[PDB]
Every structure is written in C-alpha cells, then in structure tokens.
A paper describes a structure:
The reported cryo-EM structures of the two enzymes including their active sites correlate very well with the x-ray crystal structures. Due to their thermostability and relatively easy purification scheme, both SOR and LS can serve as a model for the catalytic and structural characterization of biocatalysts as well as a benchmark for cryo-EM sample preparation, optimization of the acquisition parameters and 3D reconstruction.
LS catalyzes the formation of 6,7-dimethyl-8-ribityllumazine by condensation of 5-amino-6-(D-ribitylamino)uracil with 3,4-dihydroxy-2-butanone 4-phosphate. LS consists of 60 identical subunits that form a capsid of icosahedral 532 symmetry with an outer diameter of 154 Å and inner compartment diameter of 80 Å. The RMSD of both structures is 0.174 Å for the 154 Cα atoms. The LS monomer is composed of a central four-stranded β-sheet flanked on one side by two α helices and on the other side by three α helices. There is a channel in the center of the pentamer formed by an α helix (α3) and its four symmetry-related neighbors, with a diameter of about 9 Å, where most of the amino acids inside the channel are hydrophilic. The R108x residue interacts with R154x within the same chain and forms an ionic contact with E65m from another chain, while R68m forms a main-chain contact to the oxygen in G64m.
Residue numbers in the entry:
A (entry chain B), B (entry chain A), C (entry chain Q), D (entry chain F), E (entry chain x), F (entry chain b), ...: 1 to 154
C-alpha cells in the first residue's frame, strides 16, 4: 500500500493570496491569520504575493491570473459574504465557489477555499479570529499541505 | 511581500456596457449611475460603448461579443430582475450569473456584475439610486479598479 | 520592543504523553491526533514517551513523574470526562485541572491541557475528531509552540 | 515510541486502606470489595494495612501518615458522602478531594480515590455493590495498576 | 491484616478548643457540648485549653498557634456560619475549611471540623443541641478517637 | 499617619506583557491598548518585553519565567476567555486566576490581571476597546501604579 | 502623515474647575475625583482654581469668566442633573451643553464636559465613583490631554 501525504513545512514554497476589499474589517483579520500561519510554519514573508480585488465576485479571475504564474505553488482565496435581504448572496456565493473549483481542476494547481459564507454578522465575527477560530489560518494550512503533497506526488 | 492593487483613475480606459431593456425605468437609472461614475473619475464619454439587449437572458451573449473586442478593457453588465409568481425568476437569474462568470474566466477579462435581483419592487427601487445607493455606480467602480489592476499585473 | 514567540517546528523536541484508559474509545482518537500532529510537524516517532494511567484522577501524579525527567521538553495530558448523575464529575475535573496547573508552575515546564470535559456523549464525540476538531491535535500544537518559546526565552 | 503501562498482578505489593466510619453500612461493602480485589488478583491478605477514621474529613491526615511509611506501595481512600440539607456536603467533599490530590503530588506515591459522592441514598446504594458496580473494587484495581506502573517507571 | 483503630477513652489526653465569638448564643452551646463530651469520657477539665477569637475568619491562625504547641494532642475548631444576603458566606466558609485542612496536613496533627454552615437560623438551631444533636459533641468525639489512633499508629 | 501611594509616571520602568494567541482578534486590541497606555504615560517602547503564548492555559508558566527576571518591574497578563458549551471555560478560568495570584505572592512582584472572562461574544467585544473601555489599558495603568508604589515602599 | 496627539503629563499646566452646589453629595465626589487625577498625573495642587456656583444653570457664565483668564490652560465643568417630574430637566440640560460648546468654540480653549445627566438616582450614584467609574476623573483626563495637544499644535 503506497501512501502519499503532505508535511506541514513551508520551506521553499511560494504562495499567492487573493483577498477581497468588501467587509474589509473581517477580511484583514483573515489575511493576517493566513500570513502568520505561513511565516510561523517556516516560510519567508518575501515569498508571498498579495492581490487585492474590489469584491468577492472578482476573486476567480484574479486567482486565475495568479495561478497561471509559473513560480506559484498554491493560491489562497479569501473573502467574506454575509447574507442581506435579497437572493444576491445566493447567486454570488454559488458563482464564486464554482469558479474556483473549475479553475483548480483546469490548471491542476491547489486553490484553497477561505471564503466565509455567514447568515449573520455574529457568525461572520465568530469565524474570523474569535471562538470558532480563523478561516484564513485554516486555508493557509490546507495550502501548505497540498503544495507538499503535490511535490511528493510529482 | 509583493502587493498588487488597482487605482481609481479612469484615464485612458475603454469600457463596454451591456444593458437590458426590461424594467427600463430602473435600468436607465443604473446606466446613468455607471456613466456618471466613469466620467467623474476622469474617463472620456467617447470611450464608452453601450449595447442594448431586449432582456436579461440575452446579456451573456452580447457581453461575449463585446468582450471579444481588442479595444475594450472591461465590460459592465446591467439589468434588473424582480421575482414574480413562478420559478422563472430563479432559472433566469442562475443562468445569467453562471454565463457571465464562465465568460469572464474563459476570456481572462473583467466582467463586473451589476444586476439587481430583488424579491419586491420596493427593494429594487431602493437599490437603483435611492437610500441603499446605486448598483450601476458600484459596478463601474469595480470595473475601473479591475482594469487598473490587470494593467499593473500584466 | 523585544518580541518572543515560538515556531511550529518539532525538530529535535522530545515529548511525553499521559493518557487515561477510561473512555478509551475516545481517548485513543485523541492520542492518535496528538501523535500525528507531532510527526507531521517534523518530529520523530522515537522521541515520544507514552504513559497509560487507569483513570483521569491519576493523570497529575504520572505527569509529575514524567516532567521530572531531564530529557522531556513538554508533557501533554489527555483524558475524557463525561458528566454522569452525581457531583463526582465536578470534583474530579476540579482536582485534575488544579493539579496540572500547580505542577506546571512548580516545575517550570510546559504541561498542556488536553482533557475533554463534556456534559453529554454527543459533545464528547464532537470534540474527539469530528465536526469541532480534535483536542489532542490542539494540545500537541500548543506543546510544540511552548517548547520552542521556552527554548528561545532561555 | 517507549510505552509504559502497569500489569494487573498484585504479587508482592503492599497496600494501605483508609476507611471512614460514617455511613458504615455502605463503607464496609466498599472495603470488602477492595480487599476481595486485592486477594483475587494474587495479593496476600497479610500485606494489607487497614486504618479506620471517624469521618470523611479525617481521611487526608491518616492517609498522609500511612503514605509516609516506607513499606507501602499505594494507599486506597474509601468513604461515602451523601448530600443532606446544608452546604456542609459541598465543603467537606471539596476539602477531601483537594487534600488527597495535594498529598499524592507531594509524596510522589499513588493515592486512589474511592469516595462516593451521591445526591441521594439510592445513588449511593447503586454504587456500593449493586447495579453500577463497587467503587472499592475499582479503586483497588487502579491502585494495583499504578503500583506496577511506578515500579516499571522507576 | 493489621488493623488500627482508636478507642474512646480520653485518659491523659490534652485538647485545645478554638471557638468564635460571632453567633455566641449557639457557639456557647457547642462549646458546652464539646467540654461535656471530653469530661464524661474520662478526661480532666484541667487538660483543656480554650481560645476565643472574634470571628470565624480568624479560626485558622489561632488554631495554627495552638497546634504548634508540643503538649496538645488534638485541636477542636468550633464556629457557626449562617448565610445572609451576599456571597460573603460562600467565601468565608471556603476559606475557613481550606485553611483548617491545609494546617492539619502540614502539622500532621488532628484538627476536627466543628463548624456549622447553615442556610437558615432554624437549621443552625437544630444542629446546636436540638433534634439533630450537637456538633460540638461530635467534633470532640472525633478528636478523642483520632488522638488515640495517632498514639497507637506512632 | 504614614500614607503610601503610587504616581502615574512610567519613566524608567520596564514592563513585561504575556499575551495569548487564542481569540487574537480581540487580544491584539487589548495589547495595543496596554502598549499605548505605557508609551503615553512617559515610558519607552524599548523597555517593553512581549511574550506570545498559544492559549490562556499557558499564561502562568510564561509569566513566571518573565517575572523571575531581575530587570522587570511588573508583568501584565492579557487574554480572552469566552464561555462555550462545556464546563471547560470554568476550569480554565479558575486555573489561570489561581496560578497568577499564587505566582505574584510567591515572587513578591506585581502581576496585573488583564484577562476578559465573558459569557458572550458581545460582552467580550464591549470590553476590548468599545463602549465599556479597554481592559488592556486598565491593566497597564494598574501595573504602572503598583510599580511606583513598590518602589516607594522599598 | 503628520500626527498630533497629547501626552498625559500634567506638569506645568493650570486648570480651572467650575462645580455646582446642587446635588452636592455627588458633586463633591466628582470634584475629589478630578483633583486626584490632576495631582497624581504630576500636577500641583496650587495650580488649581475652584469656583462654586449655586446651580447647573449658572455653569456657563462662570466658566466663561474663568476661561477668559490668561493663565488658565483648560476648564473642567462639573455638575449633576437628575430628571424629576417636569420638562425642567430637558431645558436645563440642553441650555448647559449648548452654552459650554459655544463658549469653547468662541474662546478657542478646551472646556471638558463633566456633567452627569441621569434619569434615576441609581444611575447618578453609579457614575459618581461607583461601578461605572467617576465622571470627574474622566473629565480631568480629557482636559490634560487637550491642554497638551493644544500646546503641541500651537
């Protein structure tokens, strides 16, 4: 039984982060979480590319441009979506998730999902560096593990 | 840490706008908002292409033709969908959003989402130049920022 | 401003684990979580000492014997306590936590708290490798960070 | 991975038992359970020291005198506390458990907890040789395992 | 099976009593009970030392001074605490019991608990020489038995 | 009547801060509050030592190491605890507070309590730089006053 | 980015305090709070001018006379208003606040607002040196910071 798995060392890995600007008060907590995870697992702060896009709808196209780069090992997508009073939330969330998944399959590169989809502001706050943890940290950890796994699988 | 972001200057950028004719009383408010945003951020009114399509279902194909043009930096899609008494609203909205997202990923060009999806006429009016702002203005601002970002990323 | 913090590399660190036997169906999930964390952060499986004690009441004395060893950098305490029908749960939990804290202060060595205190079996299952994570993994991560921090602070 | 654990053989081990006199109708069932466990696991009835104290408040000081003896491998504390109509139960139970835990940490010797803390007489009867087992038997089993474990760890 | 136990003869034993002054109408009934028990079990009224302290908070320090005396075989602590309208009762009771227990363990001398902790004046009266007995008598009996037990154990 | 009191000048005082990483979105607001208080009362930013520990359970041992340093005048402990669904909150909070108090008494050095213990996320947010103030600022002010008081009392 | 801010040192600053006589039982607590703040932040008790006016309606005119003095750096207004049974409270409070604000703008000198406006006596007591703090202390702290800020801005 051949077993493949990824270690949690970030030595020599290069990451891209695409972060939205809407709900920036929570998005920047998520971004700090992701960067802290990368640095404290042994990565270098100079191996991180950060792209800021105006809203969550624009994440897939910028992520596609970042992932088409040769010197990027994994891409981390970060955003916050909070349901309002219309179905706008439903359509935006479905499009963002579908776009990211299709892009990852097409380019054969890891793209981790770090987007919060909350019904209320209280849930959104809970998941951005509060009692339920930090989604940016989780997404960065997943990206590190997948980059190492793909390196060993290649 | 390399950081990329877009400025909010519209100097020398060329935009396309695809606007639907259905619910024209609100659509033309959205269109005026978008054009005003472009002009007052320093763009030229002669660098704007406007395509009118009969309904919101037809937005993706016209937007595809506009985005395949070489001299268009970003495309702004504008329409109004109001839920009626049948599931027709659900299927139209899902198809429009999916089509726009897939087109943007395929052509690697920014296509901003300026379509209102409202349950009631009151919500639709609120979002078209009333207490909750103007969605056309927001879509134009997003298009300006993404055009500048893609210019700097290229 | 001098800033001290611990990295998340487990290279060259030696750990002790004290695990109770009561509720072993959940305790062994917690133990597997802790060992997996240590190994995948770069530690060696031969640098791990495992002590099994009959119940959670006996954790502090065994942990004291383990922490008095010269070649142990941090100790991880693991157990599961589920409230029954008497105040027995209250007194056991208070004694275990107080004993571990006093021992850590006396010996000036990190002793991380990986004991689940649940009101119901459902909560206990949720916290032992289910939707709310794995407490053993969290305790091991804390032990790694504190061992590195104490190394840098010394 | 070095693994330490205790066997369940009582050959050559010497035990002390401290038993309270209050609620003697249940305490003597607990004592019979403990002695039967020790004897049927291969111990000798002549290697057992039994101290009787008037009440549960007095268990820690007598247990301390017993555990300071050189030829005692583990001490088993046995008593029954049943909640009455005042907070007296709360303070007695907290003091007894805290005293036993501190004594065990100070002397570095196993002291197992065999004290029943019940809200009602029915629960107390259930736990003293009835449908829920015998707490004295459980405490003796824990003492045997810890004595063997400490022997192997030394 | 070596068996140790204390007889109920008070011949040649010297006792100290620490009694609080607050709630003196019940405290002096408790004191009379304790002294009567000692005398009618064969002790001498000249072998009794009585210390009066202003309140129940001060019992542990005076009891410590009494128990550090060489010619005192056991110390009896006596007081009455009745819950009022604030948490003051909770903190006083917890401190008194903890102090007495720690002192007894440190000095290796019997200190019996004869403090009434009642929710209502009716319970306090019941336990001070009324239908539920006399707590001072019970504490003195415990002290006699422990003094004899420690003599035989030495 | 000799009267001793501390001034609120931080000139020439050296402080240590121990801050937990859990709930970092609120902890870093508390840390900014404490540092701002120290600096604007006339202290130097180079006289501040900052230690980061993984969780609130680990605060006492790191605080002990910091307070055993000769050139530290006071230590400020900072963390956030929010009640969840289990008694875990109760035991963690009791251990942290008891450990800090015992450490301060043993080392005869001021250790101020800046840990938020909240039932809900709303209370926690209120006490971390919102309508009810900033607990880090309060803890730093207390540390300054006690350092000056101990200087004058020595 | 030029940044201006005030320190919290009161060295060499001269303050005026205008205090009303009505509700003097709470007003004198507020006054003691303000004076204590000034003195313990390094000010001199001889640099404080205190004016007593009969009621809160008279605060603005006396404050105007104090602030027209050349050797006064900031003025602290202190009073207590408690709603009665008529709209008298509404008109008095509106006039006092408006007068103080207009005076501060006209004279270009800091005048801090230390007047309690409470619906009930319980709220008034809470805000005058009880669980919610002391408003006089807060007003004095604000005056110190603004005096330093205006000094640095000049």
């Amino acid at each position: 039984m051949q077993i493949y798995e990824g270690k949690l060392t970030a030595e020599g890995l290069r990451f891209g982060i695409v972060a939205s600007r809407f709900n920036h008060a929570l998005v920047d907590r998520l971004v700090e979480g992701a960067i802290d995870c990368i640095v404290r697992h042994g990565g270098r702060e100079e191996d991180i590319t950060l792209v800021r896009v105006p809203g969550s709808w624009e994440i897939p196209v910028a992520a596609g441009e970042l992932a088409r780069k040769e010197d990027i090992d994994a891409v981390i997508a970060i955003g916050v979506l909070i349901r309002g009073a219309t179905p706008h939330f439903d359509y935006i969330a479905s499009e963002v998730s579908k776009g990211l998944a299709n892009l990852s399959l097409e380019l054969r590169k890891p793209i981790t999902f770090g987007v919060i989809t909350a019904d209320t502001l209280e849930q959104a706050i809970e998941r951005a560096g509060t009692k339920h943890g930090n989604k940016g940290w989780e997404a960065a950890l997943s990206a590190i593990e997948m980059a190492n796994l793909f390196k060993s699988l290649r």
